[PDB]
Amino acid sequence: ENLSDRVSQDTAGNTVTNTQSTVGRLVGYGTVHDGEHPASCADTASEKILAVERYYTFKVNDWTSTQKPFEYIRIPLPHVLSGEDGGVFGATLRRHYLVKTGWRVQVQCNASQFHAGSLLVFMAPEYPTLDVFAMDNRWSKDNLPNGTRTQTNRKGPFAMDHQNFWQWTLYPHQFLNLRTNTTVDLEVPYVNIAPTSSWTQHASWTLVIAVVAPLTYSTGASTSLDITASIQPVRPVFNGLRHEVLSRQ
Amino acid sequence: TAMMKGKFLIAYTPPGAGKPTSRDQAMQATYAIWDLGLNSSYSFTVPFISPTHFRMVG
Amino acid sequence: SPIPVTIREHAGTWYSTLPDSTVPIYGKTPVAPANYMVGEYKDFLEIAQIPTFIGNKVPNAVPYIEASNTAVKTQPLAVYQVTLSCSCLANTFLAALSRNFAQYRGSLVYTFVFTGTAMMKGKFLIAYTPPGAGKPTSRDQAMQATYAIWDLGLNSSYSFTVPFISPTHFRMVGTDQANITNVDGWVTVWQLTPLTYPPGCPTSAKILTMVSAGKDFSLKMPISPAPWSPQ
Amino acid sequence: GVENAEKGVTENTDATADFVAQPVYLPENQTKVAFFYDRSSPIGAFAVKSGSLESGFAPFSNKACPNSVILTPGPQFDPAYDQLRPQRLTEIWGNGNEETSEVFPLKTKQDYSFCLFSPFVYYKCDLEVTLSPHTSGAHGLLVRWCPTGTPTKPTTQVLHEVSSLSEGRTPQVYSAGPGTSNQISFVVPYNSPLSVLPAVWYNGHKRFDNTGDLGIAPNSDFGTLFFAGTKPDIKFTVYLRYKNMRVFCPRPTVFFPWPTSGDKIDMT
Amino acid sequence: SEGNEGVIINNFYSNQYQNSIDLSANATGSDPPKTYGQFSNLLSGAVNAFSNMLPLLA
Amino acid sequence: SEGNEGVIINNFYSNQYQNSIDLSANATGSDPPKTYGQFSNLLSGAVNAFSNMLPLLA
Numbered sequence: 001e002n003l004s005d006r007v008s009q010d011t012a013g014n015t016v017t018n019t020q021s022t023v024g025r026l027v028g029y030g031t032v033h034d035g036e037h038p039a040s041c042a043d044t045a046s047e048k049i050l051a052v053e054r055y056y057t058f059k060v061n062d063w064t065s066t067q068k069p070f071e072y073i074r075i076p077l078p079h080v081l082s083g084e085d086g087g088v089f090g091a092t093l094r095r096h097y098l099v100k101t102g103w104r105v106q107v108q109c110n111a112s113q114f115h116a117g118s119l120l121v122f123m124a125p126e127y128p129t130l131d132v133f134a135m136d137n138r139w140s141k142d143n144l145p146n147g148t149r150t151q152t153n154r155k156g157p158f159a160m161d162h163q164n165f166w167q168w169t170l171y172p173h174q175f176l177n178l179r180t181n182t183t184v185d186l187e188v189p190y191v192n193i194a195p196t197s198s199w200t201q202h203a204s205w206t207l208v209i210a211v212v213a214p215l216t217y218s219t220g221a222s223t224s225l226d227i228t229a230s231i232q233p234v235r236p237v238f239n240g241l242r243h244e245v246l247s248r249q
Numbered sequence: 250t251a252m253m254k255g256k257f258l259i260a261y262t263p264p265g266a267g268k269p270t271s272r273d274q275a276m277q278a279t280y281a282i283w284d285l286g287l288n289s290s291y292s293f294t295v296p297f298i299s300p301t302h303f304r305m306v307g
Numbered sequence: 308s309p310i311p312v313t314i315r316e317h318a319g320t321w322y323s324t325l326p327d328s329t330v331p332i333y334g335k336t337p338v339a340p341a342n343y344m345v346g347e348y349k350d351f352l353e354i355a356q357i358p359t360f361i362g363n364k365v366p367n368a369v370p371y372i373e374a375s376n377t378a379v380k381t382q383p384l385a386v387y388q389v390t391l392s393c394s395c396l397a398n399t400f401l402a403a404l405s406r407n408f409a410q411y412r413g414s415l416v417y418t419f420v421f422t423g424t425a426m427m428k429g430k431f432l433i434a435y436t437p438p439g440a441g442k443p444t445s446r447d448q449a450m451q452a453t454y455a456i457w458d459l460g461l462n463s464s465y466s467f468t469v470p471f472i473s474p475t476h477f478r479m480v481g482t483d484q485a486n487i488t489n490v491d492g493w494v495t496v497w498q499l500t501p502l503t504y505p506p507g508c509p510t511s512a513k514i515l516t517m518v519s520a521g522k523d524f525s526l527k528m529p530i531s532p533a534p535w536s537p538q
Numbered sequence: 539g540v541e542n543a544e545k546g547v548t549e550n551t552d553a554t555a556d557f558v559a560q561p562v563y564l565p566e567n568q569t570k571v572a573f574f575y576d577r578s579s580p581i582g583a584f585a586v587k588s589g590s591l592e593s594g595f596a597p598f599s600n601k602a603c604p605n606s607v608i609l610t611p612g613p614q615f616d617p618a619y620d621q622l623r624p625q626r627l628t629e630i631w632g633n634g635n636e637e638t639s640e641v642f643p644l645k646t647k648q649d650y651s652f653c654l655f656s657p658f659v660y661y662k663c664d665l666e667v668t669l670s671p672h673t674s675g676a677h678g679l680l681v682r683w684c685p686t687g688t689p690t691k692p693t694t695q696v697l698h699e700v701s702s703l704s705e706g707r708t709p710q711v712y713s714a715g716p717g718t719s720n721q722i723s724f725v726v727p728y729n730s731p732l733s734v735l736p737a738v739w740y741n742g743h744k745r746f747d748n749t750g751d752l753g754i755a756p757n758s759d760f761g762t763l764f765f766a767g768t769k770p771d772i773k774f775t776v777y778l779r780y781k782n783m784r785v786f787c788p789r790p791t792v793f794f795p796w797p798t799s800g801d802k803i804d805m806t
Numbered sequence: 807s808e809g810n811e812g813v814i815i816n817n818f819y820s821n822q823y824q825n826s827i828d829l830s831a832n833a834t835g836s837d838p839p840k841t842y843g844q845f846s847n848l849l850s851g852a853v854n855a856f857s858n859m860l861p862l863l864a
Numbered sequence: 865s866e867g868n869e870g871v872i873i874n875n876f877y878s879n880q881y882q883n884s885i886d887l888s889a890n891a892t893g894s895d896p897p898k899t900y901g902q903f904s905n906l907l908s909g910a911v912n913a914f915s916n917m918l919p920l921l922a
Contacts (some may be wrong), residue, residue, distance in 0.1 A: 001251050002286025003263065009919055014296075015277035020286020021508055026546035029787070030906040031344040033273065039340065040833035057276045069369055076741075110254035110285075113425035114508050118515065125346075125659050125787055126741045131750040136734045145793040146537050147629065155632020155641040157536040158792060160612065160753055166370070166398035167515070167790035167894070168358045169659065172728040172905055179425040181544060182284065183907070188901040191659065191787060193732045193740070193755055195343050195831070198267050202742030204481050212360075213422035213513040220507065228256075230282065287921050319719030321668060323578040323777070326812040328883045329666055332683070332709050334823030341662060346787040348903035349807065350791040353659070354788045356900075358543070368794035382856035392804070394797035401659065403791040407574070408656055413562055414552045420543045423703035455556055457540075462753050464543040470553035471562050477888060482802050490802065504760075517543070519611045522896040523552040527566045530576050531651055533806035536641040537793040547907050567807060576809030592916070727826040753810055755909030782809060782825070788903075812881030814874055 002182070010106070012232050017106050019183035021107075026047075028123060028188040033102020033221075035235030038196030040099070046191025055106070056081055056195065057231040063119070064223040065215045066194025070165045071139040072210035073227075074080060076203035077103055077132035081231060083248055088235055093199065094248045100196040104187045105207055106230040111178040111222060117215035121184040122173030125191045127206035128161035139211070162249040166209065175212070187234065191246040195238060201242035207231070256284040259268040318509050351404050355524065358418050358517035359399040361387070366416065368398075371422065371513040374429060378498040378506035380446040385516070389415065389435070389469055392482045399518045410477035411526035414521025417494055420464040423502065423512020431457040432500040435469040437492045446497040456499060469494055477527065560774040575652075577778035578668055581607070582615075582647035583773045589760055590766030591680060594695040597623045602645055603773050605762040609665055609726065609760035609806045611649035611656075611778060623690070626751040628739075645787035654792050656787030665760045669722040671772050678714030678768035679722060680704060687757040692764050701766045714768065725781055730757050734786060750773075 002020030004230030011016045029091050037045050061073055078099060082090050093099055126227050128147075130136065145166075174184040209227060217223070260280035265266050269275040283291040297304075348354055362368030363385065372385045385396050391411060396402040396442035405411060417433070436443050443449040457465040469492075471478075477492060502512060539555045541548055567573060568574040574663035584607055598605050599620035600669030606624060608614050613627040619638040630648060643649065682703040684690050695702040702712050713722050734753060740755035763776070797803055817824055875882055 004287075007288060008909060009915060016281045018282055018284050020284045020288060023542065023545045024907045024910045027906040027908050028646040030904045031345050035257070036343075038834045039267065039833050040342070040837070042835070044537060057280075057282070058273060059361055060369045069371075074275075079287060102629065107683045108256055108282075110256065112254055115513055116424045116427075116509055118420070118422045118424060118513075121363065124789065126736060127741055128739055128752065129742055131752060132748075152635050153629055153631055154637060155631050155639045157538060157632065157641055157644070159629035162537075162738075164790040164793040166362060166368075166793075167400050167403070169359055170354065170400055170788045170790055172546065175420070175515075175543050175544040177422055178614065179421070179423065179462060180287075180542070182256075187347050187548075190343070191345055193734055193736060193758070195340075195733060199750055200746050201744075203738075204741065206741070216424075216509045216512075218509055226547075227386060227879070229791060235912070239257060288919075289921075291920075319721075321721050322720075322725075322812060326810050326877055328781075328811060328813075328824060329668075329725055331819050331825075332615045332711065332724045333685075333727050333826065334819070335825040336727040336729065337829045338662075338728055339731060339733050340829050342830040344660075344734055344786055346659075346903070347784060348658075349571055349901045350788075351571065351574070352655075353901040353903040356548075358548055362796060364625065367598050368796055380863045382624060384573075388801055388803055392802040393788065394799070394801055394803065397794045397796060397803070400791065402555040404792065406655075408568070412564060416551060418541065418543060418548060426788075453557060462542055463550075464541045465547065466539045466551060467540045468551050468553050468555060470557060470559050476564070484804060484805050485800050485802050499660070515543075518548070519548070519553045522550045525564060525566050526569050526843070529568050529577070531579075532651060532654075533804070534642070534654070535794065537795060538641075545907055545910075561895050563894045563896040564887060564889060570807040572807055572809040576811070717891055725824075812878045814876055814878055 006050060011052050016052040017055060017230050021182045022185060023174060025185040025187055026172055028186065029191070030066045031185060031189045033190045033234040035237060037237060038098070038100050038239060040083065040195040041239045042241050045235045046092065046120040046241070047235070048122050049088065049092065051104040051247055052233060053090060055232045056085060056087065056089070057228060057230040058085055060209055060227040060229050062107035063211070063215055066212060067139050067211040068141065069212055069214065070144060070210055071077070071207065072134045072208055073139055074127065074129050075135045075229070076129040076133040076200050077205045077207065078233070080135055081204050081233070089236070090248070092238055094245040095241060097198060097242060099199045099236055099238055100190055101151050101187045102187065102231045102234030103205060104234050105174065105185070107209060108174055108183045108228045109225050111225050114221050115178045115215065115217040118213040119176040119188065120168060120173060120210045120212045121176060122171035122208050123186055123188050123220055124171045124206055124208060125204055127208060128163065128201050129206050133203040161247045165210070168230050181192050184211045201243065253285065255285045259283060259293045263298045331524045334532045337341055344475040348396070351521065351526070354405050355401060357367055357400065358519040359393055359401065360399055361516040361518050363516060365394050371515045372496065374431070374498060374514055375514050376501045376510045380497070380503045384496040384498060386442065387494040388490040389492045389494060390486060391480050397520055401518050401520055405480050405526060406532040407529055408480055408526040411480050412477045412525045413471050413523035415469045416519045416521050417467045417469065418464055418517045418519065419467070420515035421512065422515055424504065424508050426508045427459065427502050427512055429459045429502040432497045432499045433457060433467045434495050435492060436495065437472045438489060441488060442493045443495060446476070446499070449495050449497060465522065471523065478535070481532065553643055568612040571785055572783050575663070578666070578777040579649050579651045579664060580775050580777045580781040581611070581649050583775055584765060586770050587680070588770040590703070591678065591701050591768060595692045595766060597621060598794050600668050600773060604765045606761050606762055607647060608773070608775055609667065609778070611652035613646045613648040615646040618648035619647040620769070621789045625755050638748050650734055654735045657788050657791050658737050659787035659789050661737045661783060662734050663668070664725055664728055664781035666725040666781050668777040668779070669774050670777070671720045671769070671774040673769060673772040675701040675721070676716055677772055679712065680766040681711040681722065682764040683709045683711070683726060684762050686759050686761045687731065690762045703764050703766045731760060732758055737785070738789070763772065802805045
């Protein structure tokens with residue numbers, strides 16, 4: 001079973017995550033979101049809402065024997081938490097024009113000492129997601145590695161949404177290797193083209209889950225491994241208060 | 250068994266909106282994630298959240 | 308009082324790489340403060356050190372090799388040529404970075420991540436063979452060169468560094484034609500002992516393979532590779 | 539050296555860790571980012587329309603050799619509207635558009651080299667531009683540079699017999715004489731209202747309407763260039779040079795095809 | 807570091823002209839200077855104290 | 865000695881640009897600088913000491 005300097009807890013409001021097999025928290029770019037006000041806004045921000053700075057936990061998908069290498073699932077931020085599952089975060093988010101935040105994630109998946117396989121979990125700024133910024137529905141190897149080009153663009157070399165997955169480890173990441181761990185912990189600071197974001201039309205960060213070494217096991221072993229995640233906005237700062245977005249969807 | 254693995258979500262929901270009906274609603278209240286591993290138990294404390302200083306026993 | 312000048316023969320030429328600036332036409336323009344920004348790097352060497360995936364079984368590339376329950380001293384699990392041109396490295400950041408320079412020097416790091424079951428056990432012999440006598444054909448010949456024994460256990464990966472052994476201070480990055488029996492030698496992976504397991508466990512495992520630059524690694528003279536189309 | 543790559547960070551070594559060796563470091567500065575992009579590369583060939591020197595400007599292209607150019611290393615043009623003002627694209631168009639067609643030479647306009655190798659998400663820099671006429675005979679060229687996001691329809695001729703490019707207080711450059719070297723050079727400042735520019739992709743829309751079309755962030759270029767001149771038959775190459783480049787957040791580069799051949803590559 | 811420039815001579819154009827001007831914004835804002843120049847219309851006699859006063863209503 | 869150059873003026877391009885850079889390698893190798901710049905991903909919480917600890921197995 002799981003041990004000692006590998007047993008770890010993280011308290012967020014009224015939220016706390018525990019793992020008995022961690023490998024540490026990878027802090028991307030080596031910095032955390034400071035929670036500082038955007039220098040481009042004259043209005044004072046609403047910040048430090050306790051009800052907002054906690055972990056939102058929901059399920060991603062199911063890992064099976066069938067997934068092939070590099071098939072993935074994307075979770076666009078802040079969008080995934082802008083709805084009902086986003087609690088007061090979502091509610092506040094829908095009434096502000098702009099949000100500036102960092103992310104702290106934990107993705108979870110257990111198997112046994114008789115299972116073999118590994119996931120790659122990474123977080124990437126400006127990763128190409130669905131149009132509508134929603135979590136992918138099923139695993140896909142869609143539009144890797146040359147991007148999506150137009151129908152007719154018969155001879156085009158590639159499109160700007162290219163993604164050479166052979167290099168996905170350039171992104172802040174950690175491996176969820178079944179023989180080693182059960183959880184992966186990442187944290188990223190705020191990065192964007194501007195001092196704060198009009199989140200409505202931009203999913204600036206994407207949490208990506210990909211298979212790199214396919215699931216293997218002998219008969220009688222657990223057969224499908226669920227994948228869940230805990231996401232927490234790190235010191236979000238809101239500005240430009242107005243009426244509700246509404247069609248939140 | 251020592252060979253088993255798993256994670257539980259234990260939540261405390263204050264009154265007002267009824268009991269949660271899915272883990273997704275529970276997760277909106279006070280909760281903890283319990284990971285199985287070397288250490289056998291988990292001690293969850295429900296915080297005293299109340300309008301009055303005391304609560305009736307029975 | 309007008310000053311006399313002698314016009315050089317090269318009058319009027321344009322040099323794509325001139326170590327100098329041209330005429331500014333829109334001065335005193337302040338920029339938009341970008342001081343909140345993070346994640347900046349300044350030297351490619353700063354990130355060339357991050358391992359990316361080696362492609363196995365080209366052109367049906369997979370990011371791993373497979374260990375079996377049999378140790379044939381005659382059968383390498385992998386054989387990589389030590390050339391920043393190996394089709395093997397073609398998509399690693401190391402190779403993509405390197406293709407914009409003429410020469411390299413220093414250590415190459417091959418990282419192996421065991422992805423099998425916790426219940427499996429095994430030992431690998433990873434060797435680097437300098438050129439001169441051809442590639443080794445059995446673990447017995449590889450074992451005569453630089454090598455390491457990797458034992459499976461609590462710790463998941465193994466970082467093997469191929470030492471820069473060369474007559475010249477630097478080595479050419481890319482190949483003109485293809486490099487024979489040359490290149491700079493080979494990295495071969497062999498099983499020493501077979502993968503062993505208990506009942507109820509798979510009998511083969513995947514080993515993730517990545518490559519990166521060592522702290523030693525240097526690149527010089529920026530150029531452009533031959534243009535290509537990913538498709 | 540035994541290690542645990544799952545942490546997302548791996549300790550770096552030299553031959554020194556496992557064997558009896560010595561470090562073999564030697565200094566070099568050609569791998570700094572600024573030095574690497576501080577050299578000129580071409581983005582395409584352009585043309586001037588007949589008698590543009592003395593009339594209203596109008597979008598037009600010679601052989602998919604247009605009239606104006608957006609200052610950006612990313613793709614733009616779209617050979618299907620070679621007669622419309624050019625636009626930034628999210629893909630590169632091959633030379634032909636059907637099987638039997640060819641990828642090179644590309645039809646769109648871009649810094650193919652930058653495209654091929656830009657391992658960063660965002661960047662900031664100043665832009666040095668070089669206009670090179672493909673002729674060693676006299677050549678007259680009028681250029682109008684408009685900062686990003688400003689008026690780009692230099693269509694109304696306000697002065698009788700004067701190019702409409704040559705109007706206002708917007709920067710205009712002109713070289714034309716029997717003793718010139720024909721080429722033009724100048725550097726433009728950084729004018730995007732954005733703090734830093736998306737280098738490859740920008741995962742967001744143009745309006746809050748989410749009239750869904752991701753890819754490019756608005757006003758993320760260095761402006762537009764309009765040309766008028768006297769040799770409507772000579773084409774000229776436009777080159778970009780990134781002055782004091784800064785990049786943030788490493789990310790992957792363009793895919794390179796598996797040699798379904800050897801165990802090494804080459805050139806071309 | 808620096809780029810590809812290795813001229814001994816001092817740049818003939820000064821920097822504010824050769825380059826863009828990097829500015830930095832502080833989080834908490836900055837106060838405009840008090841005055842943008844000395845152009846101004848002036849309001850005089852705005853108030854009181856002094857006239858053919860206190861014959862004047864209370 | 866020197867070659868065939870006899871200009872009074874200081875070379876307009878600096879040396880590192882006008883000429884190649886003669887370097888010298890020492891027999892016994894040289895240590896890379898410790899760091900190539902300040903870009904880095906960081907691993908935190910790596911170890912221990914401090915939690916809801918020593919209820920934790922021995």
